[PDB]
C-alpha cells in the first residue's frame, strides 16, 4: 500500500465508519500528515528507551521498567523492524498513567545544525 | 529410486539401517556439542580416540525407552545378553557428550531389568498350581494399565515438544511403584515343595503391606486379594461342601503355615472335620463387598465374622 | 516456499512483542490499529504528527458518541 | 500390515504374513524398510492369528463331521459337535474387537501397533489356554462324556476369563447331555449311536 | 494483507536437534502406521520382488482394482447366482473371495436341480425347497446397503455353511416314495 | 554447558562437570577456550548441583534409614520440598528453547533463590546422620530449625514437619483408639 490510502484505514479504525462517510477528518489528517512528513529530530532508540524506563519508574512500576529492557532486546533479536525509533517514539506519546518541566531533561537533537 | 526414494524420504531410517546415520540438525552448540566436545579432546590430546558411533536422533531414544518399558525384546538400544539388559556403546546424540547418555540409559536399563524379569516370569506360566497361576493374573492386570499409560505417551509423540527430562518426570509415580515390585517379587522367586513355595509367597505380601501402614498400599492390597483368592475358595468349599478339594496338595493340611489366617484356624479345622462327619449321617464374594462399606489389621478383623458365624451354624 | 514462510513467523513475533510494549505503556491501541501504525512508521513519518492525528481522532470520537 | 494385519488376524493369510502349516503365521524376516524390533511385535501378534487359524480349521474340519454321511466325535459324532458350537461362540469377542479396531483405524489414519497390542493383549492370554483343552481331546481320543470331565478339570482354571470362557462351553455341551437324559429318563428309550450317556 | 495472513494457525512442535526457526518437521511416517496407499504400494513392491526372484516364471499381476462397497454388492449378488466382472462361469482377497464364491456355486446348483414343478412326493420336496430358497434371497439384500468386506464374510458364515450342508443332502442316486420319505426322517 | 549445565544440575554428571565423591561437581579448571571468571560462576552453580546429587543419593539410599519409618517420612517430605528446583530447571529449558543465546547471569539470577535453601536443609539432614537421631527426636531436630529466620527456609522445613507429623498422628490414632501399639524398634 501507499501512506495516503493507509491514513484512511486509520481514520476508519479510530472512528467507526466507512470511507464514504468520514471525509472531513481525513481531510484534516492529510493537512497535518502532509507537509510534516520528514523526520525533524535525529533518530536514536537509546534516548527513547531511557525515557520509557524513566516514565515507568516514575509511576512506582519499577518491575515493568526492566521488563521493557527485555522486550526491547527481542526487537533487535528478530530484525524485521527497520525504524525502531519511530514506533517507540509513538508508543511513548500515546501512553496514559493508570494511577511538568522538560526543558531541563534530555531531548532529541534538533537536526538543524546539519544542512538538510 | 521412485518408490524406494519415497521410502528414503518418508522413513526415519538411520541407526537401525545399515548406514552411517547422518543428521541435518540445526547447528549452534546446544546441538553442536559433539563437535565442541571432540575438538577440545584433540587439543587435550586423547590421543584422538575417534571411535565409530551410530549418532542417533533424540526422539527415537524416547520411542526405544517406551518399548523397553513395554517389556518387548530385540531392540537396537538395551541389547540384553544374559537376561540382563545393557546399553550399547556406539550411541551418541549431537549433545550430552556420549557419556551422560550412557548414565541416563543405565538408569532406565535398571528399570528395564525389573520389567523384563517379570515378563519372563509370566512367559514361564503361559508358554494346576492355582496360586502362582492366580498371582500372575494380578501382575498381568497391573501390566495392561501401565502399558496403556506409556502407549498413550507414544500418541502425543506422533501428533508439543517432548524430551527425556519431561518423560522421566511424567513417569515418576510409575517408576516409584515398579521399585516396590522389584522387592516384593524378589522374595517370590528366591524359593522346592509346592506348599512352601506358595505359603512363603502369600505370607510375604501380608508382611510387606504391614510394613507400609496413599497409592502404594492400594497397589499392594489389589495385588493381595487376587492372590489370596484360591485359599478362600478352598476354605469355603471345605466348609459348605464338607470335603477338602485340593490340587497337588497346595493347601497346608496335607491330608510351614501362613500367619494370615492363624487367629481363626482352629475354628476352620474344627468345622471341616465336623462337617465331614455330617454328610455321612462364596466367601471371596463376601470379603470383596466388605471393602465397599486401620488397614489389614483392624480391617482384616472384620472378615472373621463371615467365617465364624458359618462356623457356629456348622458345629451347632 | 520456505523463505516466504519464515518471514511470516518473524513478523508474527514482532507484532506480538510490540503489543506487549503497548500494553505495559497502557496505550489505547489494539492489535489491528497497531498494524496500521507500524506500517505507517516503516515508510518514514513524523511520530509527533501521527500521534497528534490519533490524539485528535480519539478526541473527536467522543463528541459523536 | 495395518489392514493386512487385521486380515491375517481374521484368518486370511497373505504373503507378508506367510502361512506355513508348520510355523503358522510367519513374517518372512528380511525387509529393508522395516527392521527387527517391529518384526518381534508382529511375530508376537502372529501367535494369536496362528491360534485363530488353527481354531477355525479345527471347527471347519471337526464339526463332528458334516452331515455324518467309524465314529468317536470329531471322527464322527455329537458331544464334540457340541464342543465346537461352544468354541466359535467363545471366540466371537475376538472377531468383534477386531471389527472395532477397523472402525478406529477408519477414524484415525496413523495408529500404532502398540495401540493394537494393548487392545488385543486380553485375547493373547485366553487363546493359548483353550488350545490345551482342544489338544487333550485330540490326543487322548476323548470319546463322548469324558470331554465333559476334560473341560471341567480345567474349569478349575485360575485366570478368571479362562474359567468363565470354559464354563460357557461346559454349559453348551451339558445341553446335549440333558437332552439325551430327558429322552431315557422320560420316554424310556436311548438315542445314542456310538457315543454314550452313561447308560448302556 | 501480510498481517492478515499473520493471524494464522501456528504449529507448536519442537525438537532438540532443531533449535533455530523450527515450527515443525514431522517424524517421516514410521512404516507400521502409514498404509492404505503406502502399504498397497508396498504389496506391489514385494510382489515385484518375488517376480524378480522367479524371473518371468511367476508373473503375478493385477495388484489394483477396484473399491469396497461395489465389491460388497458384487459378492452379495454372487449369492443370487449372478455373474459379474470378476465372477465368471493387496492380493489375498482372492482367498477371501473364494470362501464366499463357493457359497454361491451351490445356490446355482440348487436352482438347476429343483426347478421342475419321477414322483409326487419328490415334487412335494422340490416345492418345499423353493419355500426356503426365497427366504435365503429375502434375508440377503434387505440388511446391507454398503457394508465392510469382513462384515460380509463374518455375517454369511453362520448361514452359508448350512447352505453347503444342503448340497450333501441332495445330489448337488436320489430315492423316491416311502424310501425318500424315510431317508429324510 | 548450556545444556550440560542443566543436565549436571539435574543430577546427571558429565566429564566437563566431573563428578567426584570428594569434590562433588567439579569443573576441571584447565580450558583454553573459556577462562577463569566464568569458571568461578560455574563453580558457584556447581555447589547447587553438588547438594542436589547428595540429596538424591541420600533419598535413594534411605527412602528406610538404617531401617525404619520416621526418617522414611523425612525423605518423602524432602523430595517434595526439592520439587520447585526441578520445575524451575524445566522452565529454564523452555526459555533456552525460545532464545538461542542466554547468559549464565540469566541462569544465576533465576536459581539464586535455591542457592540459599539448599545449604540450609543440608544441616537438617546432617544432624540426623551424625547424632544417629532415632525416631521422634527427628521431630524435635527439624523443629529447632523451624525457628529458622530465612522465611523460605522456615516454610520449607514446616512442610517436612507436617509430613512426618502425619506418621506420628497415625501411630497415635492406633494406640489411643484401638489400644495397640504398632511400632518395630522406632517409638
UniProtKB/Swiss-Prot annotation, chain A:
Source superkingdom: Eukaryota
UniProt modified residues of type Phosphoserine: 100
Tissues of expression: Ubiquitously expressed.
Cellular localisation: Cytoplasm, Cytoskeleton, Microtubule organizing center, Centrosome
Subunit comment: Component of the gamma-tubulin ring complex (gTuRC) consisting of TUBGCP2, TUBGCP3, TUBGCP4, TUBGCP5 and TUBGCP6 and gamma-tubulin TUBG1 or TUBG2. TUBGCP2, TUBGCP3, TUBGCP4, TUBGCP5 and TUBGCP6 assemble in a 5:5:2:1:1 stoichiometry; each is associated with a gamma-tubulin, thereby arranging 14 gamma-tubulins in a helical manner. Gamma-tubulin at the first position is blocked by TUBGCP3 at the last position, allowing 13 protafilaments to grow into a microtubule.
Annotated function: Component of the gamma-tubulin ring complex (gTuRC) which mediates microtubule nucleation. The gTuRC regulates the minus-end nucleation of alpha-beta tubulin heterodimers that grow into microtubule protafilaments, a critical step in centrosome duplication and spindle formation.
Family indicated by similarity: Belongs to the TUBGCP family.
Name of the protein described by the UniProt record: Gamma-tubulin complex component 3
Organism (species): Homo sapiens (Human)
Gene behind the chain: TUBGCP3
Full-protein positions shown: 7 to 129 of 907
UniProtKB/Swiss-Prot annotation, chain B:
Protein's UniProt keywords contain Metal-binding: no
S-S bonds: none
Family: Belongs to the TUBGCP family.
A cellular-component GO term for this protein: gamma-tubulin complex
Residues of the full protein shown: 210 to 704 of 1024
Protein name as catalogued: Gamma-tubulin complex component 5
Function: Component of the gamma-tubulin ring complex (gTuRC) which mediates microtubule nucleation. The gTuRC regulates the minus-end nucleation of alpha-beta tubulin heterodimers that grow into microtubule protafilaments, a critical step in centrosome duplication and spindle formation.
Tissue expression notes: Widely expressed, with highest levels in heart and skeletal muscle and moderate levels in brain.
Cytoplasm as UniProt keyword: yes
Organism: Homo sapiens (Human)
Single Gene Ontology MF annotation: gamma-tubulin binding
Subunit structure: Component of the gamma-tubulin ring complex (gTuRC) consisting of TUBGCP2, TUBGCP3, TUBGCP4, TUBGCP5 and TUBGCP6 and gamma-tubulin TUBG1 or TUBG2. TUBGCP2, TUBGCP3, TUBGCP4, TUBGCP5 and TUBGCP6 assemble in a 5:5:2:1:1 stoichiometry; each is associated with a gamma-tubulin, thereby arranging 14 gamma-tubulins in a helical manner. Gamma-tubulin at the first position is blocked by TUBGCP3 at the last position, allowing 13 protafilaments to grow into a microtubule.
A GO BP annotation: spindle assembly
Record gene name: TUBGCP5
Domain of life: Eukaryota
Record localization: Cytoplasm, Cytoskeleton, Microtubule organizing center, Centrosome
Swiss-Prot record, chain D:
Tissue: Ubiquitously expressed.
Subunit structure: Component of the gamma-tubulin ring complex (gTuRC) consisting of TUBGCP2, TUBGCP3, TUBGCP4, TUBGCP5 and TUBGCP6 and gamma-tubulin TUBG1 or TUBG2. TUBGCP2, TUBGCP3, TUBGCP4, TUBGCP5 and TUBGCP6 assemble in a 5:5:2:1:1 stoichiometry; each is associated with a gamma-tubulin, thereby arranging 14 gamma-tubulins in a helical manner. Gamma-tubulin at the first position is blocked by TUBGCP3 at the last position, allowing 13 protafilaments to grow into a microtubule.
Function: Component of the gamma-tubulin ring complex (gTuRC) which mediates microtubule nucleation. The gTuRC regulates the minus-end nucleation of alpha-beta tubulin heterodimers that grow into microtubule protafilaments, a critical step in centrosome duplication and spindle formation.
Disease: Microcephaly and chorioretinopathy, autosomal recessive, 3: A disorder characterized by congenital microcephaly and chorioretinal dysplasia associated with poor vision and nystagmus. Variable ocular anomalies include microphthalmia, retinal folding, retinal detachment, optic nerve hypoplasia, absence of retinal vessels, round areas of chorioretinal atrophy, and attenuated electroretinogram. Most patients have mild developmental delay and mild learning difficulties.
Disulfide bridge map: none
Swiss-Prot record, chain E:
Quaternary structure note: Component of the gamma-tubulin ring complex (gTuRC) consisting of TUBGCP2, TUBGCP3, TUBGCP4, TUBGCP5 and TUBGCP6 and gamma-tubulin TUBG1 or TUBG2. TUBGCP2, TUBGCP3, TUBGCP4, TUBGCP5 and TUBGCP6 assemble in a 5:5:2:1:1 stoichiometry; each is associated with a gamma-tubulin, thereby arranging 14 gamma-tubulins in a helical manner. Gamma-tubulin at the first position is blocked by TUBGCP3 at the last position, allowing 13 protafilaments to grow into a microtubule.
Part of the whole protein covered: 282 to 506 of 1819
Protein name: Gamma-tubulin complex component 6
Subcellular location: Cytoplasm, Cytoskeleton, Microtubule organizing center, Centrosome
Organism: Homo sapiens (Human)
Disease per UniProt entry: Microcephaly and chorioretinopathy, autosomal recessive, 1: A syndrome characterized by microcephaly, cognitive impairment, underdeveloped retina and choroid, and epilepsy in some patients. The more anterior parts of the retina, near the periphery and pars plana, have a grayish hue and diminutive vasculature similar to retinopathy of prematurity. Visual impairment becomes evident during the first year of life.
Signal peptide (UniProt feature, chain positions): none
Family under the similarity heading: Belongs to the TUBGCP family.
Amino acid at each position: 500500500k501507499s501512506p495516503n490510502v493507509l491514513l484512511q484505514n486509520l481514520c476508519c479504525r479510530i472512528l467507526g465508519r466507512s470511507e464514504a462517510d468520514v471525509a472531513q477528518q481525513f481531510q484534516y489528517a492529510v493537512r497535518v500528515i502532509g507537509s510534516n512528513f520528514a523526520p525533524t529530530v535525529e533518530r536514536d532508540e537509546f534516548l527513547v528507551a531511557e525515557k520509557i524506563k524513566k516514565e515507568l519508574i516514575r509511576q512506582r512500576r519499577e518491575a515493568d521498567a526492566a521488563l521493557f529492557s527485555e522486550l526491547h532486546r527481542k526487537l533487535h533479536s528478530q530484525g524485521v523492524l527497520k525504524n525502531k525509533w519511530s514506533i517507540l517514539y509513538l508508543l511513548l506519546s500515546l501512553s496514559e498513567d493508570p494511577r511538568s518541566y522538560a526543558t531541563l531533561f534530555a531531548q532529541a537533537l534538533p537536526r538543524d545544525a546539519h544542512s538538510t | 529410486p521412485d518408490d524406494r526414494s519415497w521410502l528414503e524420504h518418508h522413513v526415519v531410517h538411520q541407526y537401525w539401517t545399515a548406514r552411517p546415520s547422518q543428521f541435518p540438525h540445526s547447528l549452534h552448540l546446544h546441538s553442536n556439542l559433539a563437535a565442541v566436545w571432540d575438538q577440545h579432546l584433540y587439543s587435550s590430546d586423547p590421543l584422538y580416540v575417534p571411535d565409530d558411533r551410530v549418532l542417533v536422533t533424540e526422539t527415537q531414544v524416547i520411542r526405544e525407552t517406551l518399548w523397553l518399558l513395554s517389556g518387548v525384546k530385540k531392540l537396537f538400544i538395551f541389547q540384553l545378553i544374559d537376561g540382563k539388559v545393557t546399553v550399547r556403546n556406539n550411541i551418541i546424540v549431537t549433545h550430552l557428550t556420549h557419556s551422560c547418555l550412557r548414565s541416563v540409559l543405565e538408569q532406565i536399563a535398571a528399570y528395564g531389568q525389573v520389567v523384563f524379569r517379570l515378563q519372563e516370569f509370566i512367559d514361564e506360566v503361559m508358554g494346576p498350581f492355582r496360586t502362582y497361576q492366580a498371582f500372575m493374573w494380578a501382575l498381568y492386570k497391573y501390566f495392561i494399565s501401565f502399558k496403556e499409560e506409556l502407549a498413550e505417551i507414544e500418541k502425543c509423540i506422533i501428533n508439543t515438544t517432548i524430551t527425556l527430562a519431561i518423560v522421566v518426570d511424567k513417569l515418576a509415580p510409575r517408576l516409584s511403584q515398579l521399585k516396590v515390585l522389584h522387592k516384593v517379587f524378589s522374595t517370590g522367586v528366591a524359593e522346592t515343595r509346592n506348599v512352601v513355595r506358595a505359603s512363603h509367597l502369600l505370607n510375604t505380601l501380608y508382611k510387606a503391606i504391614l510394613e507400609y501402614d496413599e497409592q502404594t498400599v492400594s497397589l499392594l492390597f489389589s495385588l493381595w486379594v487376587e492372590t489370596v483368592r484360591p485359599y478362600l475358595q478352598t476354605v469355603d468349599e471345605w466348609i459348605v461342601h464338607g470335603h477338602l478339594w485340593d490340587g497337588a496338595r497346595e493347601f497346608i493340611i496335607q491330608r510351614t503355615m501362613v500367619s494370615f489366617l492363624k487367629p481363626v484356624l482352629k475354628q476352620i479345622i474344627m468345622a471341616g472335620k465336623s462337617m465331614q462327619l455330617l454328610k455321612n449321617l462364596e466367601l471371596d464374594d463376601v470379603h470383596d463387598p466388605l471393602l465397599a462399606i486401620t488397614f489389614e489389621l483392624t480391617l482384616r478383623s472384620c472378615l472373621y465374622p463371615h467365617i465364624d458365624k458359618q462356623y457356629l451354624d456348622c458345629c451347632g | 516456499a520456505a523463505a516466504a514462510a519464515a518471514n511470516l513467523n518473524a513478523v508474527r513475533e514482532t507484532m506480538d512483542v510490540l503489543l506487549e510494549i503497548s500494553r505495559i505503556l497502557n496505550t489505547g491501541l489494539d492489535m489491528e490499529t497497531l498494524s496500521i501504525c507500524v506500517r505507517l512508521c516503516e515508510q518514514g513519518i513524523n511520530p509527533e504528527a501521527l500521534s497528534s492525528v490519533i490524539k485528535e481522532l480519539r478526541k473527536a470520537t467522543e463528541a459523536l458518541k | 500390515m495395518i489392514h493386512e494385519l487385521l486380515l491375517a488376524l481374521s484368518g486370511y493369510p497373505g504373503s507378508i504374513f506367510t502361512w506355513n502349516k508348520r510355523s503358522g503365521l510367519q513374517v518372512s524376516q528380511d525387509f529393508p524398510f522395516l527392521h527387527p524390533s517391529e518384526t518381534s511385535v508382529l511375530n508376537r501378534l502372529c501367535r494369536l492369528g496362528t491360534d485363530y487359524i488353527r481354531f477355525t480349521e479345527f471347527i471347519e474340519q471337526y464339526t463332528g463331521h458334516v452331515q455324518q454321511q467309524q465314529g468317536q466325535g470329531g471322527l464322527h459324532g455329537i458331544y464334540l459337535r457340541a464342543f465346537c458350537t461352544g468354541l466359535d461362540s467363545v471366540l466371537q469377542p475376538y472377531r468383534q474387537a477386531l471389527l472395532d479396531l477397523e472402525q478406529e483405524f477408519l477414524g484415525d489414519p496413523h495408529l500404532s501397533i502398540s495401540h493394537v497390542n494393548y487392545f488385543l493383549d486380553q485375547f493373547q492370554l485366553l487363546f493359548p489356554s483353550v488350545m490345551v483343552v482342544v489338544e487333550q481331546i485330540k490326543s487322548q481320543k476323548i470319546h463322548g462324556c469324558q470331554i465333559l470331565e476334560t473341560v471341567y478339570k480345567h474349569s478349575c482354571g485360575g485366570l478368571p476369563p479362562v474359567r468363565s470362557a470354559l464354563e460357557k462351553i461346559l454349559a453348551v455341551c451339558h445341553g446335549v447331555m440333558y437332552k439325551q437324559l430327558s429322552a431315557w429318563m422320560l420316554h424310556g428309550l436311548l438315542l445314542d449311536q456310538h457315543e454314550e450317556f452313561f447308560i448302556k | 494483507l501480510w498481517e492478515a495472513a499473520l493471524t494464522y494457525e501456528a504449529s507448536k512442535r519442537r525438537c532438540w536437534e532443531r533449535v533455530g526457526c523450527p515450527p515443525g518437521h514431522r517424524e517421516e511416517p514410521y512404516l507400521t502406521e502409514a498404509g492404505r496407499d503406502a502399504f498397497d504400494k508396498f504389496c506391489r513392491l514385494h510382489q515385484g520382488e518375488l517376480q524378480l526372484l522367479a524371473g518371468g516364471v511367476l508373473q503375478a499381476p493385477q495388484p489394483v482394482l477396484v473399491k469396497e462397497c461395489e465389491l460388497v454388492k458384487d459378492v452379495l449378488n454372487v449369492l443370487i447366482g449372478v455373474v459379474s466382472a470378476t465372477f465368471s462361469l493387496p492380493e489375498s482377497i482372492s482367498s477371501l473371495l473364494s470362501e464366499v464364491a463357493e457359497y454361491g456355486t451351490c445356490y446355482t446348483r440348487l436352482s438347476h436341480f429343483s426347478l421342475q414343478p419321477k414322483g409326487l412326493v419328490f415334487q412335494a420336496f422340490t416345492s418345499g425347497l423353493r419355500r426356503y430358497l426365497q427366504y435365503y434371497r429375502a434375508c440377503v439384500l434387505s440388511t446391507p446397503p454398503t457394508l465392510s468386506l469382513l462384515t460380509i464374510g463374518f455375517l454369511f458364515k453362520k448361514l452359508g455353511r448350512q447352505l453347503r450342508y444342503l448340497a450333501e443332502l441332495c445330489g448337488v442316486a436320489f430315492p423316491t416314495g416311502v424310501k425318500l420319505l424315510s431317508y429324510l426322517y
